[PDB]
Amino acid sequence: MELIRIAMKKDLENDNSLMNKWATVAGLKNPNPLYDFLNHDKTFNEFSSIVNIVKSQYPDREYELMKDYCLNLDVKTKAARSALEYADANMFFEIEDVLIDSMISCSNMKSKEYGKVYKIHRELSNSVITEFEAVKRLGKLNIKTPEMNSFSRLLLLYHYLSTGNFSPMAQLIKQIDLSEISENMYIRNTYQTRVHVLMSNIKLNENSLEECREYSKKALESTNILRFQVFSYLTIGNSLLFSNYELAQENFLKGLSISVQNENYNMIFQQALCFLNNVWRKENKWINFESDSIMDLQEQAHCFINFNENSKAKEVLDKLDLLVHNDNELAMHYYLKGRLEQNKACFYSSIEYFKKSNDKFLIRLPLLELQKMGENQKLLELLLLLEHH
């Protein structure tokens, strides 16, 4: 017996009303499949049934209980395909990569299709393959299911988001039509959350901040998955960075409060608060002085310049010069050199690379500095109007 079923039976002996409770949590029109699930080594027809029960009754042991249940599934079933998405959405890479290689080797074609394009997503996000290679591999697969035709576009969106290449995203996300996913409602629903959070990030990058916040608030209402809650609070807080210090801070701190036991999510909200305080030129207690990532070094330099410690800032910025920057990171690098050097040409290179990344939000930083240095208002309008081709 799986631990989930051992634990559910130990609690069934002591508490009989748990049956009607677990049946409504799982969304069941009648309580038969619960009994069936506990007696015969069978699945629910929708993966949410077991997830919602583990989250309702054993929330402190979800990872342990799901890693045991998922890894004991027959990889040929709709349940195991559902567990693949559950694993990837939760960033449970240990659960995920095991399912992937199981499915890729199996004799089931649907499971085989899921496995192979989830492997492409994993290899691309680890930079094991290039974007060209990914597209080439996906095309050869002749993907037939709507689910994987949708996820084939999602994995590219994630890759554009993380490489600071925002230009292609708006047109690609529109190609997703989730209404065609009819058989696996668990996948339709978690993909719907994925699209809400991605749309929130696209609207942020277009400087459409009220629609940014609405999509993130729709993501939160749609989900019980920590990873999607984390990036919704991050994106809402980012959208407030230039206008509302307290509410941006409150969203980042809310993210911190749900991220407690997760060092990667906790680091992200520390970086978000570190950047917020540098934008507002406040004392910055969030700086990571033991990091050599571009993200963290930039904020060291930013705070040094804010507090008139320009020799220390140049030391940092000299280190950054030796690192490979994507376009969006490069745009921030020139903004900082602009501030340190008080040189308008750096601010012009900054906006060049914000234009290339198609970042219409962070470009407000070099634009504001050029305003302070007295640049012509018509010139700034023109620079906002024109596009990178």
Partner: peptide
């Protein structure tokens, strides 16, 4: 910089 993700 500013962290982002989805």
């Amino acid at each position: 910089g500013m962290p982002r993700g989805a």
